[PDB]
Amino acid sequence: MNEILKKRLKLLKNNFGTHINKIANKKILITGANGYIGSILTLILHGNAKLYCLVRNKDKMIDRFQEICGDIDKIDIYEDLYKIQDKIDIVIHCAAPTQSDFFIENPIDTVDIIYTNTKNILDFSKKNNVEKIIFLSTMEIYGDVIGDNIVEDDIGKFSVTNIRNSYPLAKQISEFMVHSYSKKYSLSTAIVRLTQAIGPTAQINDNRVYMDFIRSAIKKSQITLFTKGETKREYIDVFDVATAIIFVMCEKKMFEIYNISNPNIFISIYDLAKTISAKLNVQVVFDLQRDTSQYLPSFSRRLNSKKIYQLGWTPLFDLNQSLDDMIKYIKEVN
Amino acid sequence: ENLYFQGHMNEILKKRLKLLKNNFGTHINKIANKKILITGANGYIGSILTLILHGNAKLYCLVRNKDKMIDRFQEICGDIDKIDIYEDLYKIQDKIDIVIHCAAPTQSDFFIENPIDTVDIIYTNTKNILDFSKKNNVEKIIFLSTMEIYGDVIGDNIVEDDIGKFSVTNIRNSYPLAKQISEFMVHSYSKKYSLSTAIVRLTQAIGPTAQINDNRVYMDFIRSAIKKSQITLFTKGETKREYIDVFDVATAIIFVMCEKKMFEIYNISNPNIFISIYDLAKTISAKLNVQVVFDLQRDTSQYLPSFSRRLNSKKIYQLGWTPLFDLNQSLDDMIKYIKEVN
Numbered sequence A: 001m002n003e004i005l006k007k008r009l010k011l012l013k014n015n016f017g018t019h020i021n022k023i024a025n026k027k028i029l030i031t032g033a034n035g036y037i038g039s040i041l042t043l044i045l046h047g048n049a050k051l052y053c054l055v056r057n058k059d060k061m062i063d064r065f066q067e068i069c070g071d072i073d074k075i076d077i078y079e080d081l082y083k084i085q086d087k088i089d090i091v092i093h094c095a096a097p098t099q100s101d102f103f104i105e106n107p108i109d110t111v112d113i114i115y116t117n118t119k120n121i122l123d124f125s126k127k128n129n130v131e132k133i134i135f136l137s138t139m140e141i142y143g144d145v146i147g148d149n150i151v152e153d154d155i156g157k158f159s160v161t162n163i164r165n166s167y168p169l170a171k172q173i174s175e176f177m178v179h180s181y182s183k184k185y186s187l188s189t190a191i192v193r194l195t196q197a198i199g200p201t202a203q204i205n206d207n208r209v210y211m212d213f214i215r216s217a218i219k220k221s222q223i224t225l226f227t228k229g230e231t232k233r234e235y236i237d238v239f240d241v242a243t244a245i246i247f248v249m250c251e252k253k254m255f256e257i258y259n260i261s262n263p264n265i266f267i268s269i270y271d272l273a274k275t276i277s278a279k280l281n282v283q284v285v286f287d288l289q290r291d292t293s294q295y296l297p298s299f300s301r302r303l304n305s306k307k308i309y310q311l312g313w314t315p316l317f318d319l320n321q322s323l324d325d326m327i328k329y330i331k332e333v334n
Numbered sequence B: 001e002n003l004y005f006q007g008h009m010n011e012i013l014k015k016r017l018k019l020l021k022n023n024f025g026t027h028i029n030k031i032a033n034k035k036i037l038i039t040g041a042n043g044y045i046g047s048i049l050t051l052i053l054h055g056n057a058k059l060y061c062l063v064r065n066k067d068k069m070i071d072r073f074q075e076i077c078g079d080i081d082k083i084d085i086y087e088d089l090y091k092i093q094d095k096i097d098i099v100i101h102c103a104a105p106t107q108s109d110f111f112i113e114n115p116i117d118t119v120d121i122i123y124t125n126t127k128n129i130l131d132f133s134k135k136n137n138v139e140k141i142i143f144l145s146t147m148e149i150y151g152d153v154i155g156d157n158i159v160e161d162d163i164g165k166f167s168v169t170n171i172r173n174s175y176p177l178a179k180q181i182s183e184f185m186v187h188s189y190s191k192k193y194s195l196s197t198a199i200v201r202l203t204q205a206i207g208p209t210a211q212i213n214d215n216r217v218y219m220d221f222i223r224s225a226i227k228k229s230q231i232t233l234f235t236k237g238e239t240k241r242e243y244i245d246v247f248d249v250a251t252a253i254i255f256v257m258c259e260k261k262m263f264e265i266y267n268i269s270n271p272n273i274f275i276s277i278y279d280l281a282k283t284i285s286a287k288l289n290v291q292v293v294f295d296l297q298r299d300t301s302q303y304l305p306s307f308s309r310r311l312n313s314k315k316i317y318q319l320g321w322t323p324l325f326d327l328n329q330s331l332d333d334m335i336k337y338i339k340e341v342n
């Protein structure tokens, strides 16, 4: 646990400590600081910068932060955006609902939360004279655009009658706002679009596919696929997402959109079940007669990631170490 | 005054309301006595709807400024006693039966000069009217939407299942994106809380009671003719769309109000009025005896790129609706009405 994390932290600081210290003593606010990516950014940066962490619930941000070996006292945790009086130089907006079920069960809320939080955070930044804001977005913004070498100018098309579009539509409008604040008020903004993050400190209560697999293998000595498992995507280790964001934080550029993916990790859902079954000594069963309306249709997509590689970033964590480090940290917690 | 003992309401508006009763009073009447909230009731379309329905029906209006709603509703010779204006939803106490959500920005310049407010006004207004329609236990909500939602989808015969795609770095997409996210919320509310909703996508309304401050191209062409003895085209004017009389928009909406259907989308267009911007400019130049000139040197960033497009309007027609007002009557009545104001 301390093993896994400490290694990585030293790996990051070995390879990139140059860049990480272009934000020494920068005043940095992270929204959703309690979530998967939020935490690890907080973890990586709080020694080397003043960190403000905006979260839904301070107490569990405290539990979570010292589970991942953090220094409670080197971060200021707010629950209310308007109590943050200090001047922020960099905002990293990471807050959003993450579960597939919530997107189809509460599509209105999904939109309202994401839309309102984006609006508020943009107000805040422009009023607080922020130097840069980074907005986490999603590969789901590409919609019907399938296949390889998808570039940040490709544009998805979205039906207003498909409930599950709650999530992309919400991130789409947020992006549009983000770019519009940049062009109206010459405020530097970046949008970063993730595939799906994996790796240590993922929680067993997550229902995104990687953890549905790990958790089914452990708790039911079985992994069940509700589809044929032909969806093919790239994955990335959460620390590789953090580092990518850091490289983007250091860039002077009034506006840019960056895909974030590890292109070496391209694999199908089925192939992902198999690897995880092998690592956890379990078998893979199908069951294709359940309701799957929270899920996306079958597709394949690779993201052109030329921009983050041009900044000098590289991914440190292949699929194996990411899975192993993820699995190990779930065992070691329960 | 009333020297011929026939009342004093505007002649153009009188005639239009009478054709409207003769042709479609069956449906207009089916809405009688029904409690009806109209948002943006001060605007071009909401006000004509209010004027049409506030005879027979009890009618609640929602507006930014009750002031200019009173002034609007009497420019168009409404009866202020028979409507109940409000600036805030949380007042409205009585059981609303039907909601017609018409409020929205309307001006191209505002979409590029205020893209964030364009989004935020439409989103918030939509969300609010939806919360309210769920609280109050409304029969049906009708959301007014735009052909701009078709975005890049161009050409003839565009259906309601088609949809556009929008770049997040084109500022001018404020409007369509706001309407898209709103359409989506309207559908999501229907599917999730069995709230009967209808979406009506409009081309561009014209006809009498168009106010002279409006900068959409029809009035750009009319206020230009009159205030400067000249009609100026800032593009080659090849854009080709369908237009519709504002009264014809209103009847279309009333027809949809009489439908009992959980969720439906309707394109609202008069396909008999399919004209280029250039030909629109010509016909308006002929009726005011002014000339048409090109100025291609201005910033046109608030304007959509040049396209040609027809909406498929079969569904509205299959209900029994027809447009009563061809291009000639709509322009003529629209010019005459502006002249009586100044």
Ligand SMILES: Nc1ccn([C@@H]2O[C@H](COP(=O)(O)OP(=O)(O)OC[C@@H](O)[C@@H](O)[C@H](O)[C@@H](O)CO)[C@@H](O)[C@H]2O)c(=O)n1
Pocket: A097, A098, A099, A100, A138, A140, A194, A195, A196, A197, A207, A208, A209, A210, A212, A224, A225, A226, A227, A228, A229, A231, A269, A294, A295, A296, A297, A298
């Ligand atoms: N028990 C299973 C589980 C899964 N599958 C298959 O895996 C696919 C992928 O599963 P999911 O990723 O969990 O669900 P989804 O399709 O909704 O995509 C969500 C994804 O875009 C987001 O999670 C973002 O990556 C994230 O960054 C947001 O914060 C499913 O669509 C289904 O085909 C399955 O067959 N049997």
Ligand SMILES: Nc1ccn([C@@H]2O[C@H](COP(=O)(O)OP(=O)(O)OC[C@@H](O)[C@@H](O)[C@H](O)[C@@H](O)CO)[C@@H](O)[C@H]2O)c(=O)n1
Pocket: B105, B106, B107, B108, B146, B148, B202, B203, B204, B205, B215, B216, B217, B218, B220, B232, B233, B234, B235, B236, B237, B238, B239, B277, B302, B303, B304, B305, B306
């Ligand atoms: N002085 C002129 C004026 C115009 N034109 C041309 O006419 C086109 C049409 O002008 P506009 O309609 O005013 O501008 P826009 O393209 O922004 O379309 C707005 C329209 O989609 C909405 O107004 C909806 O119809 C309405 O329902 C929203 O409430 C311009 O894009 C331009 O090519 C011109 O050449 N010279």
Ligand SMILES: [Cl-]
Pocket: A031, A032, A033, A034, A035, A054, A055, A056, A057, A095
């Ligand atoms: Cl959080």
Ligand SMILES: [Cl-]
Pocket: B113, B114, B115, B116, B117, B118
């Ligand atoms: Cl704005």
Ligand code: NA
Pocket: B160, B266, B267, B312, B313, B314, B315, B316
């Ligand atoms: Na139709």
